[PDB]
Design a protein around this motif. Structure first.
Motif, PDB file in Angstrom:
ATOM      1  N   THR A   1      10.686  11.213  -1.756  1.00  0.00           N
ATOM      2  CA  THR A   1      10.525  10.521  -0.489  1.00  0.00           C
ATOM      3  C   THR A   1       9.680   9.259  -0.725  1.00  0.00           C
ATOM      4  O   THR A   1       8.969   9.151  -1.726  1.00  0.00           O
ATOM      5  N   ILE A   2       9.809   8.275   0.175  1.00  0.00           N
ATOM      6  CA  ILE A   2       9.009   7.050   0.126  1.00  0.00           C
ATOM      7  C   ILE A   2       7.515   7.349   0.246  1.00  0.00           C
ATOM      8  O   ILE A   2       6.691   6.715  -0.426  1.00  0.00           O
ATOM      9  N   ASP A   3       7.138   8.350   1.038  1.00  0.00           N
ATOM     10  CA  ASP A   3       5.741   8.770   1.073  1.00  0.00           C
ATOM     11  C   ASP A   3       5.335   9.590  -0.145  1.00  0.00           C
ATOM     12  O   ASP A   3       4.146   9.888  -0.300  1.00  0.00           O
ATOM     13  N   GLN A   4       6.279   9.961  -1.004  1.00  0.00           N
ATOM     14  CA  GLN A   4       6.007  10.594  -2.287  1.00  0.00           C
ATOM     15  C   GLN A   4       6.341   9.641  -3.422  1.00  0.00           C
ATOM     16  O   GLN A   4       6.896  10.034  -4.445  1.00  0.00           O
ATOM     17  N   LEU A   5       6.040   8.368  -3.235  1.00  0.00           N
ATOM     18  CA  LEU A   5       6.254   7.341  -4.238  1.00  0.00           C
ATOM     19  C   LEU A   5       4.901   6.887  -4.766  1.00  0.00           C
ATOM     20  O   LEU A   5       3.854   7.434  -4.414  1.00  0.00           O
ATOM     21  N   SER A   6       4.923   5.861  -5.608  1.00  0.00           N
ATOM     22  CA  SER A   6       3.698   5.253  -6.100  1.00  0.00           C
ATOM     23  C   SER A   6       3.121   4.352  -5.010  1.00  0.00           C
ATOM     24  O   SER A   6       3.645   4.257  -3.897  1.00  0.00           O
ATOM     25  N   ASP A   7       2.029   3.661  -5.319  1.00  0.00           N
ATOM     26  CA  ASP A   7       1.486   2.651  -4.420  1.00  0.00           C
ATOM     27  C   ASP A   7       1.721   1.256  -4.970  1.00  0.00           C
ATOM     28  O   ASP A   7       1.129   0.289  -4.485  1.00  0.00           O
ATOM     29  N   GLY A   8       2.571   1.144  -5.984  1.00  0.00           N
ATOM     30  CA  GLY A   8       2.928  -0.129  -6.564  1.00  0.00           C
ATOM     31  C   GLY A   8       4.420  -0.324  -6.573  1.00  0.00           C
ATOM     32  O   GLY A   8       4.912  -1.450  -6.676  1.00  0.00           O
ATOM     33  N   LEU A   9       5.148   0.782  -6.467  1.00  0.00           N
ATOM     34  CA  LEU A   9       6.585   0.729  -6.268  1.00  0.00           C
ATOM     35  C   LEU A   9       6.957   0.725  -4.798  1.00  0.00           C
ATOM     36  O   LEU A   9       7.924   0.064  -4.421  1.00  0.00           O
ATOM     37  N   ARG A  10       6.164   1.391  -3.956  1.00  0.00           N
ATOM     38  CA  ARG A  10       6.402   1.395  -2.519  1.00  0.00           C
ATOM     39  C   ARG A  10       6.090   0.044  -1.891  1.00  0.00           C
ATOM     40  O   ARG A  10       6.797  -0.385  -0.977  1.00  0.00           O
ATOM     41  N   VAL A  11       5.066  -0.654  -2.388  1.00  0.00           N
ATOM     42  CA  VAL A  11       4.718  -1.975  -1.867  1.00  0.00           C
ATOM     43  C   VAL A  11       5.788  -3.005  -2.228  1.00  0.00           C
ATOM     44  O   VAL A  11       6.209  -3.811  -1.383  1.00  0.00           O
ATOM     45  N   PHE A  12       6.267  -2.977  -3.475  1.00  0.00           N
ATOM     46  CA  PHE A  12       7.340  -3.883  -3.873  1.00  0.00           C
ATOM     47  C   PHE A  12       8.652  -3.520  -3.192  1.00  0.00           C
ATOM     48  O   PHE A  12       9.439  -4.407  -2.845  1.00  0.00           O
ATOM     49  N   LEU A  13       8.897  -2.223  -2.981  1.00  0.00           N
ATOM     50  CA  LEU A  13      10.070  -1.789  -2.234  1.00  0.00           C
ATOM     51  C   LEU A  13       9.999  -2.255  -0.790  1.00  0.00           C
ATOM     52  O   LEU A  13      11.018  -2.641  -0.220  1.00  0.00           O
ATOM     53  N   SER A  14       8.804  -2.245  -0.194  1.00  0.00           N
ATOM     54  CA  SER A  14       8.643  -2.735   1.170  1.00  0.00           C
ATOM     55  C   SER A  14       8.907  -4.232   1.256  1.00  0.00           C
ATOM     56  O   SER A  14       9.602  -4.688   2.173  1.00  0.00           O
ATOM     57  N   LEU A  15       8.405  -4.999   0.279  1.00  0.00           N
ATOM     58  CA  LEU A  15       8.642  -6.444   0.238  1.00  0.00           C
ATOM     59  C   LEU A  15      10.127  -6.768   0.090  1.00  0.00           C
ATOM     60  O   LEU A  15      10.693  -7.521   0.894  1.00  0.00           O
TER      61      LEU A  15
END
Ligand SMILES: Nc1ncnc2c1ncn2[C@@H]1O[C@H](COP(=O)(O)OP(=O)(O)OP(=O)(O)O)[C@@H](O)[C@H]1O
Lengths: 550, 211, 157, 79
Positions: C117-131
């Motif tokens: 899940t997106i909430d079970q991702l990293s905090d550096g892949l989720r930020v770039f994925l959000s961008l």
């Protein structure tokens, strides 16, 4: 039974004297004359003994740190055992390796220590049952096992934090009783005599937050010692509490201590002026100032008395810590304008207010200032309160920092806080260039979670070049492989050894591309020129060897 | 890689015969002093220093079960199998990664010379040798593809900086060719052939020094 | 950016796939797949009712797509272009979808090889994925006339 | 009474019984019965390569028994 505990206390143990203290403290003196006193004296010695070494740093005789961390079915880790160093532990790896999860588990472990110090019988944070459980695991429970070291009398303080998913037959629970016992010892000796409590802090990603500067959060509590444990493992440094505390210190330094306490007695004299003016009609401000005197009596007596050191020395120590660790800011001081109280720093010789500081020089000041605040509030019996014990979990110390400033961040942090066991998780090789090989834990880039150990890199990283650390430890090329302009030396050597070292038709035009791209003074063209001369005179050696052979 | 002089069959593996028992029954310490005499304590696949090492079978045991106890199959491996996943070079990578390969599609350092089929450049990258076409060219591609010389970062960067660390040495020793005489200038190259064997990388520095 | 807006728009766009709002398409979604369950072309006379059950359903779902392919964008085409952009740019994510096998609307990715899940991702892949996800969303819903809406004009800081 | 929790519980129950054990086993059984009523005379060419869905009928019968291996309400029975 009593004799065995007394023999263990003679042999050296903090816990063995604790139940003796708890069983003899409830009766009367005569039967307690010197009996409670010798165990209190020995317990306070075991907490407070320390010596100054040849370098001038106070070192405790009974250091407190975390030894081992075990994660079973926790997030992505099947069964992972980590051995942590005494002074600094660095966890490195790709995005996807659970190196923030390690800090999250240690913070959840330390939450029990913080809560049980703060309130007797308290409860710390618990593991989530939606995300922390491994979604591949079939046992449907996850436990985080830690061991703490508190000297030769206390070799092991075990703690386990367990959580089961909903629907399991057996409800797995924690075994936080030794953490409960140790924090009970600290709290019940602190309630009767002042000691130096350790600092537990977590600086996660959420320290990267904007500054509001219009912050009127609850005024009055930000000078008490147990406020220093308030949201200290949340993840974000409490810069709000620091700046409120620092305005408190500026007002008390310029007014309350330079020419004695005046700002309360002037309005006391205002009430004595207005108390006999006729009809009273001032009951709203008759009592709201009367307990401000009580506040300044029962809260400032600790800070001025022998338990907590002088407030001007507190200001000097936190300012010295800020200007020593924080790179370009060299002084920090407060201005009082009509209706406003704002803190300004000297950044690169420019007087800059905090809210318009840069985001890479303000989220490191939010770490250093808050950490120095908690040490000077929790360790007041030291000449340098930055030399107190504790565990601090920084997540990505290289955040928002220039590579010029990453060359000294952990040296400055370990210089200012020698007795703190920092546990940092960086991404950059330049931070690793200032950190020993034994202080580094690493993840291989094939690490599906099965490993039972995290090991140091093979090569020493304390003096190695950044390209060597990047290309030996972090498994990254120095020149990118996704660029066709980077393989030009390799294609040059292939096309030059195709025609035995002559610049005939392909090597000359590709040399022209290298010269027109990288530049005349370029080191790549310098290698290209050196290889051209070496391989054009190699045919001369071939001819000479042919003439010798035949 | 290097010519390995296959000297003599050890007498440890003569008693145990394949088929009756697997490879795990023999103790692992009685073959290593026999192997290190001809290898110099080196993985002969990444041409490679053995800080940690194990025994690697050139042809796989699962496919050819009656080949393990011949002693023509035993070599050293860069790294060890005890890493919970291992490395990505030399011996571990062939048994774990890569894919399908043929027995005759591989170069064997015991008798076949790797000097005229593969070529170590000055940048640390391996290429096939010039003028090579056909089955031997496919073999030269396949050995690099299964042994990961063009590949993992810790091998490629270390070989690159080991070759690039002697480029001023090669330049200033070669630019005095006209200054020095014949025998006392080839004495320099015999000095290099007496120098390079106390290093990790030998054939790469051989290709950097002479041709 | 607005990653919560992207996630809400993504689950919305997935639930609207493929019946839209003209309906029309919804009235050519339910009963069309339920013919073969009940009577299957009448006592199985012609079983598949020609081979037009494939090729995107007798090009009659495509009836509200032939002028909605590149004159505007079909919502399945919008979702596929955003998915392709996320998996093409963002590193160590190679698939993205929405699931409701549980009771909640949650999006999932394929971080390395594990479906998390997106909430079970990293905090550096989720930020770039959000961008990347938010920017690709804005391009596909500000460029309707393009074949590939990511090849549009703009300035991004 | 909370007619806010009921809507969430209802949408929850519909979501776990749409892409799971749901109201499609009757459609699958009717499809198998209608195909068998026509291939009884012959022409099993429309049964040979459509046998995957007929085996998927029994595959959908599988993983359902664990929901009904106890005396408790099924999530599609509550709805
Ligand atoms: N509850 C969970 N269940 C399974 N895997 C999880 C869970 N939480 C996180 N993960 C995994 O852990 C990783 C998340 O990265 P993490 O934040 O732990 O580290 P980092 O960002 O690299 O620092 C991903 O590989 C993700 O799949």
């Amino acid at each position: 039974m009593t004799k065995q505990y007394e023999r263990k206390a003679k042999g050296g143990n903090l816990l063995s004297a604790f139940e003796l203290y708890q069983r003899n403290s409830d009766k009367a003196p005569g039967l307690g004359e010197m009996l409670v006193g010798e165990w209190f004296e020995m317990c306070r010695d075991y907490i407070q003994d320390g010596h100054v070494d040849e370098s001038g740093i106070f070192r405790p005789d009974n250091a407190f740190y975390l030894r081992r961390l075990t994660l079973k079915d926790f997030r992505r880790f099947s069964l992972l055992e980590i051995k942590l160093e005494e002074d600094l532990t660095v966890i490195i790896g790709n995005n996807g390796k659970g190196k923030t999860s390690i800090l999250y588990a240690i913070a959840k472990t330390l939450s029990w220590f913080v809560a049980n110090i703060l309130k007797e019988g308290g409860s710390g944070q618990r593991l989530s049952e939606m995300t922390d459980i491994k979604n591949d695991a079939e046992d449907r429970y996850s436990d985080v096992s830690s061991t703490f070291f508190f000297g030769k009398g206390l070799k092991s303080v075990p703690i386990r934090l367990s959580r089961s998913a909903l629907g399991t037959a057996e409800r797995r629970d924690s075994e936080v009783k030794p953490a409960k016992d140790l924090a009970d010892i600290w709290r019940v000796i602190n309630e009767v005599n002042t000691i130096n409590l350790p600092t537990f802090a977590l600086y996660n990603v959420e320290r990267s937050q904007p500054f509001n500067r219009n912050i009127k959060d609850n005024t009055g509590r930000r000078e008490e010692r147990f406020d220093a444990y308030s949201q200290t493992l949340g993840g974000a440094g409490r810069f709000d509490h620091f700046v409120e505390w620092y305005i408190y210190l500026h007002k008390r330094t310029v007014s309350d201590i330079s020419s004695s306490i005046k700002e309360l007695e002037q309005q006391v004299n205002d009430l004595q002026r207005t108390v006999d003016g006729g009809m009273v009609s001032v009951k709203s401000l008759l009592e709201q100032m009367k307990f401000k005197l009580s506040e300044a009596i029962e809260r400032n007596d600790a800070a001025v008395s022998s338990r907590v050191l002088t407030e001007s020395v507190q200001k000097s120590i936190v300012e010295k810590a800020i200007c020593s660790v924080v790179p370009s800011i060299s002084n920090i001081w407060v201005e009082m304008i009509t209706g406003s109280d704002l803190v300004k720093v000297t950044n690169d010789g420019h007087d800059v207010t905090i809210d318009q500081l840069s985001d890479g020089l303000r989220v490191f000041l939010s770490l250093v200032a808050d950490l120095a605040r908690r040490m000077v509030m929790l360790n007041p019996l030291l000449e340098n309160p930055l030399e107190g014990r504790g565990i601090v979990l920084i997540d990505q110390i290289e955040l928002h920092l220039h590579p010029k400033w990453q060359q000294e961040v952990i040296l400055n942090l370990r210089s200012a806080f020698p007795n703190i066991q920092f546990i940092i998780t960086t991404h950059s090789p330049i931070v690793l260039s200032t950190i020993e090989k034994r202080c580094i834990r690493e993840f291989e880039p094939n690490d599906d979670g099965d490993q039972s150990f995290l090991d140091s890199p093979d090569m020493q990283t304390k003096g190695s070049e950044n390209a060597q650390i990047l290309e030996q430890v972090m498994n990254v090329h120095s020149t990118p492989p996704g660029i066709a302009e980077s393989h030009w030396l390799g294609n040059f050597e292939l096309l030059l050894l195709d025609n035995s070292g002559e610049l005939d038709n392909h090597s000359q035009v590709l040399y022209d591309q290298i010269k027109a791209h990288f530049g005349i003074d370029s080191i790549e063209l310098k290698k290209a020129d050196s290889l051209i001369r070496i391989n054009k005179m190699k045919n001369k050696l071939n001819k000479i060897r042919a003439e010798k052979g035949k | 890689m290097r010519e390995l002089a296959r000297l003599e069959r050890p007498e440890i593996l003569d008693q145990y015969i394949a088929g009756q028992n697997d490879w795990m029954e023999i103790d692992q310490s009685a073959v290593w002093p026999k192997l290190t005499e001809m290898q110099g304590g080196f993985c002969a696949y990444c041409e490679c220093r053995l800080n940690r090492c194990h025994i690697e079978h050139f042809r796989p045991r699962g496919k050819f079960p009656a080949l393990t106890f011949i002693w023509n199959n035993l070599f050293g491996s860069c790294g060890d199998s005890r890493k919970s996943g291992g490395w990505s070079r030399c011996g571990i990578y062939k048994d774990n990664g890569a894919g399908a390969y043929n027995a005759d599609d591989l170069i064997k350092p015991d008798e076949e010379n790797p000097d005229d089929y593969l070529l170590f450049l000055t940048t640390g990258e391996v290429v096939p040798a010039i003028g090579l076409t056909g089955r031997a060219l496919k073999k030269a591609q396949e050995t690099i593809r299964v042994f990961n010389l063009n590949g993992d970062i810790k091998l490629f960067g270390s070989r690159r900086t080991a070759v690039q660390a002697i480029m001023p040495n090669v330049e200033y020793l070669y630019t005095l060719l006209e200054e020095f005489d014949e025998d006392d200038w080839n004495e320099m190259l015999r000095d290099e052939l007496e120098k390079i064997e106390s290093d990790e990388y030998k054939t790469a520095l051989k290709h950097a020094w002479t041709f």
